[PDB]
């Protein structure tokens, strides 16, 4: 934000968030023909007013015309800042929400591998921002039904979170997560099962100190009795896993365990 539109944004920001899309708009629409005779079109700080009216637009469920001002805002951005510059990112994203939410799924995938590309060069492939950039990208693919692809981004965001951050880290396991409900979403229920495990053997590993051969993990105390908020999730997941497998006595164990860990 210019200091410059500074002061003018926070009273839009202001007459927007008391509902007075009548009062709003046209405080944009205004300041923008005034800094369009001033600095010419083509001037990043337009871009700026741009992304501002179209976020007021976005604000009041205009995503028609939201859009319509981002793509503008984009073009200029492109002009003088750059192809692959990081505000022209910025843009291809915010554009991108845009027509998730307008259900143009198809339309805003061809953005959102842009603002990786972007991301990937300016960050560097292995950035934990890339890790995001991923994770959103492959429920893009998912709200698509591109299952192979959903599997693909979310397992390179997985390579990113688990090398770079910890391991206990929620990202670590929110990611594997969604990646075991990709694999279940086409039928790869090794895998899923694999991975709904491994978050659990840590998560027991985290508060039991260690992994031991008397001291084992939910999922192995139930394999043998049918002889973190991420983790409740896990627990229903593998839970109903088994059932499905028709290990009840294991199924009801961690079904069992879920209700009281709360």
Not at 67 to 94: F, M, S, Y
Not at 204 to 230: C, D, L, Q, Y
């Amino acid at each position: 934000i210019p200091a410059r539109l500074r002061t003018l944004h926070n009273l839009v920001i202001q007459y927007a968030s008391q509902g007075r899309y009548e009062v709003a708009v046209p405080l944009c629409k205004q300041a923008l023909e005034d800094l369009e005779k001033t600095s010419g079109h083509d001037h990043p700080d337009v871009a700026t007013m741009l992304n501002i009216l179209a976020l007021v637009y976005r604000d009041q469920n205009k995503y028609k015309d939201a859009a319509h001002l981002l793509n503008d805002a984009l073009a200029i951005r492109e002009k003088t800042l750059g192809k692959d510059h990081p505000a022209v990112a910025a843009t291809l994203n915010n554009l991108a929400v845009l027509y998730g939410k307008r259900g143009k799924y198809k339309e805003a995938e061809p953005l959102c591998k842009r603002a990786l590309e972007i991301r990937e060069k300016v960050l560097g492939k292995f950035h934990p921002d890339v890790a995001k950039q991923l994770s959103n990208l492959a429920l893009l693919c998912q709200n698509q039904g591109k299952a192979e692809e959903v599997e693909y981004y979310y397992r390179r965001a997985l390579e990113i979170y688990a090398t770079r951050l910890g391991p206990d880290d929620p990202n670590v396991a929110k990611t594997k997560n969604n990646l075991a409900s990709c694999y279940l979403k086409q039928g790869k229920y090794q895998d899923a099962e694999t991975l709904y495990k491994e978050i659990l053997t840590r998560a027991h590993e985290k508060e039991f100190g260690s992994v031991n051969g008397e001291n084992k993990p939910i999922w192995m105390h139930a394999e043998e009795r049918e002889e973190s908020p991420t983790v409740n999730t896990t627990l229903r997941s593998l839970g109903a896993l088994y059932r499905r497998q028709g290990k009840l006595e294991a199924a009801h164990t961690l079904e069992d365990c879920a209700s009281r860990s709360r």
